PDB file of N, CA, C and O in Angstrom:
ATOM      1  CA  UNK A   3     111.237 111.747 101.715  1.00  0.00           C
ATOM      2  C   UNK A   3     112.014 111.199 100.528  1.00  0.00           C
ATOM      3  O   UNK A   3     111.704 111.500  99.378  1.00  0.00           O
ATOM      4  N   UNK A   4     113.026 110.390 100.828  1.00  0.00           N
ATOM      5  CA  UNK A   4     113.868 109.782  99.802  1.00  0.00           C
ATOM      6  C   UNK A   4     113.363 108.391  99.454  1.00  0.00           C
ATOM      7  O   UNK A   4     113.244 108.038  98.283  1.00  0.00           O
ATOM      8  N   UNK A   5     113.070 107.611 100.490  1.00  0.00           N
ATOM      9  CA  UNK A   5     112.574 106.247 100.323  1.00  0.00           C
ATOM     10  C   UNK A   5     111.196 106.258  99.680  1.00  0.00           C
ATOM     11  O   UNK A   5     111.032 105.840  98.536  1.00  0.00           O
ATOM     12  N   UNK A   6     110.213 106.740 100.435  1.00  0.00           N
ATOM     13  CA  UNK A   6     108.833 106.817  99.963  1.00  0.00           C
ATOM     14  C   UNK A   6     108.797 107.133  98.476  1.00  0.00           C
ATOM     15  O   UNK A   6     107.893 106.707  97.762  1.00  0.00           O
ATOM     16  N   UNK A   7     109.794 107.888  98.024  1.00  0.00           N
ATOM     17  CA  UNK A   7     109.903 108.280  96.622  1.00  0.00           C
ATOM     18  C   UNK A   7     110.511 107.156  95.800  1.00  0.00           C
ATOM     19  O   UNK A   7     110.046 106.853  94.705  1.00  0.00           O
ATOM     20  N   UNK A   8     111.559 106.544  96.348  1.00  0.00           N
ATOM     21  CA  UNK A   8     112.255 105.446  95.686  1.00  0.00           C
ATOM     22  C   UNK A   8     111.280 104.334  95.331  1.00  0.00           C
ATOM     23  O   UNK A   8     111.082 104.018  94.160  1.00  0.00           O
ATOM     24  N   UNK A   9     110.677 103.750  96.363  1.00  0.00           N
ATOM     25  CA  UNK A   9     109.714 102.666  96.191  1.00  0.00           C
ATOM     26  C   UNK A   9     108.893 102.878  94.929  1.00  0.00           C
ATOM     27  O   UNK A   9     108.467 101.922  94.286  1.00  0.00           O
ATOM     28  N   UNK A  10     108.679 104.146  94.588  1.00  0.00           N
ATOM     29  CA  UNK A  10     107.911 104.517  93.404  1.00  0.00           C
ATOM     30  C   UNK A  10     108.648 104.104  92.141  1.00  0.00           C
ATOM     31  O   UNK A  10     108.159 103.289  91.362  1.00  0.00           O
ATOM     32  N   UNK A  11     109.831 104.681  91.951  1.00  0.00           N
ATOM     33  CA  UNK A  11     110.662 104.393  90.787  1.00  0.00           C
ATOM     34  C   UNK A  11     110.601 102.913  90.443  1.00  0.00           C
ATOM     35  O   UNK A  11     110.262 102.539  89.322  1.00  0.00           O
ATOM     36  N   UNK A  12     110.935 102.081  91.426  1.00  0.00           N
ATOM     37  CA  UNK A  12     110.927 100.631  91.257  1.00  0.00           C
ATOM     38  C   UNK A  12     109.566 100.158  90.771  1.00  0.00           C
ATOM     39  O   UNK A  12     109.465  99.191  90.020  1.00  0.00           O
ATOM     40  N   UNK A  13     108.524 100.857  91.214  1.00  0.00           N
ATOM     41  CA  UNK A  13     107.151 100.531  90.840  1.00  0.00           C
ATOM     42  C   UNK A  13     106.986 100.574  89.329  1.00  0.00           C
ATOM     43  O   UNK A  13     106.191  99.831  88.760  1.00  0.00           O
ATOM     44  N   UNK A  14     107.751 101.456  88.693  1.00  0.00           N
ATOM     45  CA  UNK A  14     107.711 101.621  87.243  1.00  0.00           C
ATOM     46  C   UNK A  14     107.731 100.266  86.553  1.00  0.00           C
ATOM     47  O   UNK A  14     107.364 100.147  85.385  1.00  0.00           O
ATOM     48  N   UNK A  15     108.166  99.251  87.293  1.00  0.00           N
ATOM     49  CA  UNK A  15     108.246  97.887  86.777  1.00  0.00           C
ATOM     50  C   UNK A  15     106.857  97.353  86.468  1.00  0.00           C
ATOM     51  O   UNK A  15     106.707  96.362  85.757  1.00  0.00           O
ATOM     52  N   UNK A  16     105.848  98.026  87.015  1.00  0.00           N
ATOM     53  CA  UNK A  16     104.454  97.640  86.815  1.00  0.00           C
ATOM     54  C   UNK A  16     103.999  97.997  85.409  1.00  0.00           C
ATOM     55  O   UNK A  16     103.244  97.258  84.783  1.00  0.00           O
ATOM     56  N   UNK A  17     104.473  99.142  84.926  1.00  0.00           N
ATOM     57  CA  UNK A  17     104.130  99.627  83.592  1.00  0.00           C
TER      58      UNK A  17
END
């Protein structure tokens, strides 16, 4: 997984 996946979403801030 839930986290490992989450960290990604937030990454979208890059983009």
